[PDB]
Amino acid sequence: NMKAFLDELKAENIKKFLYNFTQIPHLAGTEQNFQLAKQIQSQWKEFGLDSVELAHYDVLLSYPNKTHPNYISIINEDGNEIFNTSLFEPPPPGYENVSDIVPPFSAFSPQGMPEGDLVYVNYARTEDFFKLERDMKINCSGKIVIARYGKVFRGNKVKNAQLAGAKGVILYSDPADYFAPGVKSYPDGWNLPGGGVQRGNILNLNGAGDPLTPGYPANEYAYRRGIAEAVGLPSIPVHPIGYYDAQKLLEKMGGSAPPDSSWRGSLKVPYNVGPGFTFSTQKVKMHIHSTNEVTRIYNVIGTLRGAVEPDRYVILGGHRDSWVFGGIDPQSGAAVVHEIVRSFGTLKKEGWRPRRTILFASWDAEEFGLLGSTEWAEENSRLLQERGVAYINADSSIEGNYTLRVDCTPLMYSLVHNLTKELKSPDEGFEGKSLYESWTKKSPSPEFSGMPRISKLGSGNDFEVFFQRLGIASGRARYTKNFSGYPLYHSVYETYELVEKFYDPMFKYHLTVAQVRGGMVFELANSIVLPFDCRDYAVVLRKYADKIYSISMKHPQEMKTYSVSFDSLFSAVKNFTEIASKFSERLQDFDKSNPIVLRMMNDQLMFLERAFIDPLGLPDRPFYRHVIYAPSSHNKYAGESFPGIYDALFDIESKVDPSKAWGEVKRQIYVAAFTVQAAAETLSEVA
Amino acid sequence: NMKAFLDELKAENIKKFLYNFTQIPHLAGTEQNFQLAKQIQSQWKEFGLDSVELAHYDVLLSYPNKTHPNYISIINEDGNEIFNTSLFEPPPPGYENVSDIVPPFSAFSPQGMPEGDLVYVNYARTEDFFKLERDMKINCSGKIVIARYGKVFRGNKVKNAQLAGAKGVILYSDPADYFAPGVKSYPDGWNLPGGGVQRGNILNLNGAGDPLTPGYPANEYAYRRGIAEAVGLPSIPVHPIGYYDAQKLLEKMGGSAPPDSSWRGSLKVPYNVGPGFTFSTQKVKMHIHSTNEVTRIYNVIGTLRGAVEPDRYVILGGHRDSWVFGGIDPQSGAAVVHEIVRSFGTLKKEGWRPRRTILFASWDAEEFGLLGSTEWAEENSRLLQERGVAYINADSSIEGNYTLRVDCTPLMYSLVHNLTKELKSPDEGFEGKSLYESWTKKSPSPEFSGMPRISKLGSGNDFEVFFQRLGIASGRARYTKNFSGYPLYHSVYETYELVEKFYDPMFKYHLTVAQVRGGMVFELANSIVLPFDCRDYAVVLRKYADKIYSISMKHPQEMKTYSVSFDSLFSAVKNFTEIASKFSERLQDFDKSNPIVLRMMNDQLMFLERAFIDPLGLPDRPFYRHVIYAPSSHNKYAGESFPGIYDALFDIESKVDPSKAWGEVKRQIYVAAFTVQAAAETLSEVA
Ligand SMILES: *[C@@H]1O[C@H](CO)[C@@H](O[C@@H]2O[C@H](CO)[C@@H](O[C@@H]3O[C@H](CO)[C@@H](O)[C@H](O[C@H]4O[C@H](CO)[C@@H](O)[C@H](O)[C@@H]4O)[C@@H]3O)[C@H](O)[C@H]2NC(C)=O)[C@H](O)[C@H]1NC(C)=O
Ligand SMILES: *[C@@H]1O[C@H](CO)[C@@H](O[C@@H]2O[C@H](CO)[C@@H](O[C@@H]3O[C@H](CO)[C@@H](O)[C@H](O[C@H]4O[C@H](CO)[C@@H](O)[C@H](O)[C@@H]4O)[C@@H]3O)[C@H](O)[C@H]2NC(C)=O)[C@H](O)[C@H]1NC(C)=O
Ligand SMILES: *[C@@H]1O[C@H](CO)[C@@H](O[C@@H]2O[C@H](CO)[C@@H](O)[C@H](O)[C@H]2NC(C)=O)[C@H](O)[C@H]1NC(C)=O
Ligand SMILES: *[C@@H]1O[C@H](CO)[C@@H](O[C@@H]2O[C@H](CO)[C@@H](O)[C@H](O)[C@H]2NC(C)=O)[C@H](O)[C@H]1NC(C)=O
Ligand SMILES: *[C@@H]1O[C@H](CO)[C@@H](O[C@@H]2O[C@H](CO)[C@@H](O)[C@H](O)[C@H]2NC(C)=O)[C@H](O)[C@H]1NC(C)=O
Ligand SMILES: *[C@@H]1O[C@H](CO)[C@@H](O[C@@H]2O[C@H](CO)[C@@H](O)[C@H](O)[C@H]2NC(C)=O)[C@H](O)[C@H]1NC(C)=O
Ligand SMILES: *[C@@H]1O[C@H](CO)[C@@H](O[C@@H]2O[C@H](CO)[C@@H](O)[C@H](O)[C@H]2NC(C)=O)[C@H](O)[C@H]1NC(C)=O
Ligand SMILES: *[C@@H]1O[C@H](CO)[C@@H](O[C@@H]2O[C@H](CO)[C@@H](O)[C@H](O)[C@H]2NC(C)=O)[C@H](O)[C@H]1NC(C)=O
Ligand SMILES: *[C@@H]1O[C@H](CO)[C@@H](O)[C@H](O)[C@H]1NC(C)=O
Ligand SMILES: *[C@@H]1O[C@H](CO)[C@@H](O)[C@H](O)[C@H]1NC(C)=O
Ligand SMILES: *[C@@H]1O[C@H](CO)[C@@H](O)[C@H](O)[C@H]1NC(C)=O
Ligand SMILES: *[C@@H]1O[C@H](CO)[C@@H](O)[C@H](O)[C@H]1NC(C)=O
Ligand SMILES: *[C@@H]1O[C@H](CO)[C@@H](O)[C@H](O)[C@H]1NC(C)=O
Ligand SMILES: *[C@@H]1O[C@H](CO)[C@@H](O)[C@H](O)[C@H]1NC(C)=O
Ligand SMILES: O=C(O)CC[C@H](CP(=O)(O)O)C(=O)O
Ligand SMILES: O=C(O)CC[C@H](CP(=O)(O)O)C(=O)O
Ligand SMILES: [Ca+2]
Ligand SMILES: [Ca+2]
Ligand SMILES: [Cl-]
Ligand SMILES: [Cl-]
Ligand SMILES: [Zn+2]
């Protein structure tokens, strides 16, 4: 039963697994990552799984040149390189020994050696560039942009920059965002040293997976696009730096004041916007020599065969590749999955099987754009779309230690509420209380009433292809602090010791996340009726219809002129509410003894997420096919609701053909109303 | 049981229903068609169906102007209209009374009054226009084209013509194609009078359905494209004529000889290719004033709820709208469905239910581009794709009386072989023999050995959206003669009397088709294991891989230069063969007493057709998503195999960038190999 499963999970095992996974770097595409894959595969096998395979793909990755390193220089009027950024981060204590730690770089940067004047853009958000090209009249064309990490996925920044005319982008971590007051720099606390740099890919894939093979798995005979038709590649050079190198680049900055305090970070510089220095006369020069190359990656796929519904799949998945040691990102999640597997494997050895098939993935090349999960799902899309019950992600278990952070489909809200009431809170001062209670006290619902917050799914992690492309019900759960990443994110300093010393010394937060993650997978794979509640979707559809309506209503004159009505969407939502309500009644009133009727009802619950998929995709985003949710076009990490309408409405005041534009709003309202109505009809009596 | 069902079908009932359906015209969008819909709905209800609804859509139709009729003129040097084509066909005996019979027109022609020189193009096939622009050097630009009906769908002709530069198209029926020797003109035989004209739409929809709403049902709040972005509309005027009016237009034709005898039909004219007349000096002038208009259509949808698997759908569908009386096209099929329904309804009244849900459709606006079936399937696509077992079409039951013509997915071959051996042949001189035997003797397999021919599915009928877009296993069966249509196709002369007197006086061929159609639907809806044989797909995949390979091999030098290999496709096919073979074994070896295992296996059989769908669609044909089959791009009526590769290879010698072109061949080989491999993997053990 469930308690047997939950009781078999040990904090000390997680600790032991995390330590094992963090001793050397496991960069995607390296032999070391391959060996960790082989090792996971052997162990998941010894743990009891019925089968464990490696699935590999040949995908575009990116790597710095070993003998021609990347850096940024201030040059002078003659071409003397006055200042030079780091070539590497100062390795932490006792790892000065590291074989090779990849130096900081922006994965998928083109090669280049541009120079020019600097313009500071804050976080390089859409609103930042609006304030700058619209209010301030500064002009980024031909400039090198310099932006701080935080707020939004760094891919959006590069795209915003690229589109505003920039010839290069420099990213850095500012202590305002990456140094929490009163805590020390690593190795003596969990803050980011002025020499720490955040690695990370800067693609805009929009769900495509491998850049060269959109639509189809990068298998042995894959046909690939030439790199010039590749998906998501930035066209200007980009490089990240720490805040020491940053001060050096920022302190000589001229032009206009920062437009206000929200543009100014913590270093002792003015945070002038530029362009150029006070100093005229010197320029910034970038040196980028990273190369893109097709490289083999490996997913580990374990299978625990279901006793009754083997042709129904509950998937627990998270990635194995790290930028360096992956002390938090991903091995604190990977060590949790290892212990979940060990625990299910234990029950199986004593002769239990779950009701449905459970699938366990160790994904590769996630850091490079969710490539392993995506290629695997393109290869197995027909199985997934007819057999896929749910997907539970398992990246970083902790990014803090204040409370639970849950993002999931509405179908799993009730499941998550019930599971957490059955779990002990590991929180100081809530001993003998449930996780539900601490989580609700600490992160209260905005909606209300006495409920916790649960957020929408966007992207930036491996659930993306399962939810956004395929319409498989998905959730994730981790411990969090009070979109920027904790301070030591994607740095050489994110190590086992960072976690053992400063994050979770007892491994008690890991154990909690293992219980929430393994708990969901257990209920999903074993409850006789799928634990989804379609009425929960009815409720959020109404909130999102209100929301998108309110946004349109900021423009009453155009709504009159063009006859923009939301009547069809509200009507659809009202029908989905009534039909879901009747479906719940039938679900309460039938005999679980009749298997075929059970299967029919479970198939309705199962295909309901699926009903929100449009096979034509969203406008310009063929791999984002869900109509209710998509990643924000301004921030991959953030979930947006009614994305088609949201984007047709965004900055609509600026389109030059208002009636073309409002026409497309109307078209999107129609697609949404229709999809919500069609989804609802999946829950009607079937004949 | 089956025999009870088959024995309840009566030839005399079919006769009575066909007579009832043919007394007045039932043109899509008219009140008369609406009343026939209401009537079908009441009767299917009295017959016993559990529910019967009307589903309506507002779609673009096309109609001649009542007070400004269409015709073609020869004008002279001054503008005197010397010759004028008919305004209508001479109505048949006793129907000179007809309320209104729509005059001959090409549905969806733009309006226009162009004049110019005539060029004769034979059947206006791709090869005809090749022979003419390549061999003969004649140039169709600014000319009016005149082409005979036959060989290919008239939409392709208009598209070929349009693309070759034409300013108008005139279609006519030539007696070579539409007058069988030794038979008389209607009313005294079944041949086409020199005053008969074939009506018909001339769209290129490529599966889109309603022109204005591709992707989504043309419901109440549908957003519609402006007519200029409508799908499939021809841009030059087109009008059809009989062979009397044709002789008048052809007899004065100048320019070059016909390139050979295959270009010459039966009228006493030279069949010169033009351009222009001998007569200089006079021109041809077209007068077209038809209008396009959004018009309401109605499908009748009856439901017979399944006793065990109600959430599994077997669909019997065919259209109700006719160009005029629809004596053969469609009411000889519609009267068969009426009798099938009556018969199932009888069993139900005695307390039987089929195992699966059976759905019965009377589709509207088929003649106008399969619009009713398509809109309905877009509206209900999520139900269809998860619950759809099979679709059996039911258009014209007879287009002759020589033998059976069956087109279907390979999955149904074995079903059709077994059903026909259990059926009496209605053929003169095969009394006491089975339909299988007459059908095999009369239409022998080309493949071999002692098997009948079964052809591929293309399009030109209502199964299109179910098979080509959705991947639902589909078949059709009718009686045929020894792609052009019988002689009285889409003419005022296709009447009840044409059928009672000359086609099927006993109604014995109708009864046979009712038995083959209702027989399939019965087995599909009642057999405990779905009657599909996946090994039959294995066999044809190998033949098609051979075929497409041979076509590529007409170009060995390019295959070397570009490294074009079919190794992946053959490998996929070989694996599909082995895995299908193992799947058959398991299907033989499991206990039908275990329902969940039964359901799992039926779901594999059911989703196997579905596995061949690519959600990205074929190149440029987003609504044709099946990878093994598509309608021919040169002839909608014809099925083509490995369409993606076939079209990348077609006329490849002429592409100006041979390596771009051969690259796309390679990409298509990859898509096909991958899809065949993925389809096969749906038949593997599921865990
Ligand atoms: C939510 O579910 C409800 C079903 O409970 C559903 O309501 C349906 O709405 C449509 C209109 O939106 C109705 O269709 C109408 O009724 C009949 C057809 O049976 C016609 O007379 C009407 O047509 C006339 O009026 C039209 C416009 O007002 C004209 O354009 C037209 O040419 C006619 O002259 C009209 O088609 C239908 O009756 C209800 N169904 C009910 C109440 O049972 C609603 O649409 C669902 N929401 C969504 C978004 O799907
Ligand atoms: C039909 O089914 C068979 C399975 O029975 C399947 O065969 C598979 O083919 C691929 C090659 O096409 C094999 O993968 C290889 O084997 C190992 C990985 O386990 C590697 O050593 C190989 O890689 C080396 O060589 C490559 C090229 O030759 C190099 O590019 C590469 O970098 C390596 O140095 C290679 O990946 C696989 O072993 C078999 N599976 C078997 C026999 O079990 C076949 O592909 C299926 N057909 C289709 C079209 O799917
Ligand atoms: C993590 O643990 C694994 C397995 O417990 C260690 O690898 C095993 O132990 C030794 C290492 O040579 C061998 O006898 C086994 O063959 C290894 N088993 C495998 C790979 O499954 C591994 O070395 C540990 N990693 C670290 C850095 O501690
Ligand atoms: C920053 O780095 C550059 C590159 O290594 C340094 O300039 C080089 O210096 C050597 C010897 O002085 C010369 O042979 C090269 O011509 C220089 N390379 C280039 C491309 O300029 C530079 O001195 C460094 N600057 C600082 C302040 O340390
Ligand atoms: C979460 O728990 C609640 C409370 O147990 C569950 O709702 C009950 O479920 C039973 C079983 O069908 C019903 O008979 C009760 O009427 C329900 N109570 C309420 C308040 O609805 C709910 O099913 C659980 N959610 C899951 C398991 O997903
Ligand atoms: C075809 O048969 C139908 C039904 O048998 C005829 O319509 C019915 O018969 C009379 C006609 O006014 C009425 O009492 C019924 O209400 C009609 N029933 C319906 C419409 O379901 C119909 O007129 C026949 N058509 C022809 C031309 O013979
Ligand atoms: C073919 O049809 C046209 C159109 O009806 C005939 O020409 C018309 O004749 C009347 C009276 O003679 C004139 O008022 C119109 O000007 C003509 N219309 C046009 C547009 O030309 C023509 O005579 C007919 N030709 C034959 C041979 O019957
Ligand atoms: C068509 O009929 C053949 C002959 O009856 C069927 O094949 C037999 O099916 C039974 C039932 O599984 C097997 O045990 C026999 O071994 C089969 N004989 C052969 C020659 O295969 C076949 O199943 C029928 N096809 C259908 C119903 O789709
Ligand atoms: C890296 O740069 C070296 C040293 O200058 C050069 O020889 C080599 O081409 C580069 N390797 C690649 C292509 O990354
Ligand atoms: C920015 O500067 C360049 C000239 O160097 C110009 O072409 C570009 O259009 C400018 N952008 C704006 C907003 O004026
Ligand atoms: C872990 O828990 C303590 C308790 O408040 C917290 O303040 C400390 O800073 C936490 N560690 C991190 C990395 O936030
Ligand atoms: C048909 O032509 C008539 C008569 O000349 C004209 O008045 C009317 O506009 C036309 N109707 C339409 C638009 O089909
Ligand atoms: C046919 O004629 C026109 C001139 O009237 C010309 O522009 C067009 O390109 C010609 N086509 C060919 C194949 O020469
Ligand atoms: C019907 O059957 C006879 C028997 O040969 C055939 O010759 C006759 O022409 C058929 N009718 C039609 C329309 O083909
Ligand atoms: O490519 C993405 O969508 C995200 C990759 C990675 C996700 P993770 O850092 O592993 O949480 C990142 O944000 O840089
Ligand atoms: O639009 C089509 O695809 C075909 C419509 C109709 C099919 P049918 O004549 O009813 O067999 C025709 O060929 O003109
Ligand atoms: Ca791919
Ligand atoms: Ca449509
Ligand atoms: Cl996660
Ligand atoms: Cl048919
Ligand atoms: Zn990461």
Ligand SMILES: [Zn+2]
């Ligand atoms: Zn991660």
Ligand SMILES: [Zn+2]
């Ligand atoms: Zn027709």
Ligand SMILES: [Zn+2]
């Ligand atoms: Zn027809």
